[PDB]
Design a protein around this ligand. Structure first.
Ligand SMILES: Nc1ncnc2c1ncn2[C@@H]1O[C@H](COP(=O)(O)OC(=O)CCCC[C@@H]2CCSS2)[C@@H](O)[C@H]1O
Ligand SMILES: [Mg+2]
Length: 329
């Protein structure tokens, strides 16, 4: 076996490590535990819709990153109070429940008789009620990996707010997340910091696999240790990967503009993250049909993105309309 810990807090490089080990490491008789922490990041599953899963506006104005991982499943929040664990094995040795049991041992080592259980859907629940860990996994040609979270000191009130989407009128068959009551380990026992739990998990893994209790710190940007890793990190951070992989969806919504008032109806089909069909319908007593048709036509093929939409009475109405549209992206 082998225990690695990333020195980086950049989700995209840390995910690239997963890709890399998956692609390049011989895991036969040598499983790998990989420990990592990210800066503030919402991580959606492979087949998810981020407009459906999080408050993107609040994320942008707080500097919270969005990443899409290669495994399926739901949406979680990562910050420095959260530990990520990746158990790499051969496909034959893929065993999610074995890994979760190992984590339970580790937690009990630093807090004897901690009430943490693993459920059938691979969550870890604290005191039979509160989610402290969620699981996903990926199978490849040469390897399997199981990764999970571990909430030690994560901003729980901030977590809940970032994962509450304000986007209305979305019709999609993208993968849904499963909301849960969560808790931190440090809420139960203030000694269970990330550092303490990381060490506890490494120690347990070392004993379980009969290897030296040594964490090898690794640099996920090092092309000499990990040839080709920076191209993986680039791909993972492309708009095409993060947003463009979103399953087909439609938006059917409206908003009101002061004038009394005027209601504008918005019908937008979004495919591959790009505006495939666009019909913004303003009352022709407020804005000429040709002007709305201009706006609809210019949006076609454009990215469903609040950036790629910015670029006397009518000009003022246009701006109000553009800003409302920006606000749903
Ligand atoms: N960090 C973290 N840990 C545990 N639970 C969380 C977290 N963030 C949010 N949640 C709660 O879980 C649900 C989502 O649960 P759901 O079951 O829908 O999704 C998951 O658990 C997926 C886990 C993915 C783990 C990967 C590991 C390396 S990269 S991300 C969310 O609505 C909140 O209630
Ligand atoms: Mg789970």
């Amino acid at each position: 076996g082998l225990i690695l810990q990333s020195i980086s807090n950049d989700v995209y490089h840390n995910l690239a490590v997963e890709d890399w080990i998956h692609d390049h490491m011989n895991l036969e008789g040598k499983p790998v535990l990989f420990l990592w922490r990210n800066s503030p990041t919402v991580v959606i599953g492979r087949h998810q819709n981020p407009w459906q899963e999080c408050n993107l506006n609040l994320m942008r104005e707080e500097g919270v990153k969005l990443a899409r991982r290669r495994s399926g499943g739901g949406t979680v929040y990562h910050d420095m109070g959260n530990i990520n664990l990746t158990f790499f094995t051969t496909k034959k040795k893929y065993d999610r429940m074995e890994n979760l049991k190992l984590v339970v041992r580790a937690l009990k080592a630093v807090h004897p008789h901690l009430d943490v259980q693993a459920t059938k859907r691979f969550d870890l629940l604290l005191d039979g009620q509160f989610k402290i860990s969620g699981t996903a996994s990926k199978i490849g040609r040469n390897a399997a990996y199981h990764h999970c979270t571990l909430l030690c000191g994560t901003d729980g009130t901030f977590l809940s707010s970032l994962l509450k989407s304000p986007y209305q009128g979305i019709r999609s068959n993208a993968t849904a997340s499963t909301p849960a009551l969560v808790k931190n380990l440090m809420e139960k026992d203030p000694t269970l910091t990330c550092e303490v739990v990381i060490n506890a998990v490494a120690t347990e893994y070392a004993t379980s696999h009969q290897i030296d209790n040594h964490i090898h710190l690794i640099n996920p940007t090092d092309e000499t240790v990990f040839p080709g890793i920076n191209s993986k990190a680039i791909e993972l951070q492309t708009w095409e990967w993060i947003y463009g992989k979103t399953p087909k969806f439609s938006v059917d919504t409206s908003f009101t503009v002061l004038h009394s008032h005027v209601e504008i109806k918005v019908f937008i089909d979004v495919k591959n993250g790009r505006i495939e069909v666009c019909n913004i319908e303003a009352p022709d007593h407020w804005l000429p049909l040709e002007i709305c048709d201009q706006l609809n036509s210019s949006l076609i093929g454009s990215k469903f993105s609040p950036i790629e939409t910015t670029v006397d009475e009518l000009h003022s109405k246009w701006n109000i309309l553009c800003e409302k549209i920006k606000g749903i992206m």
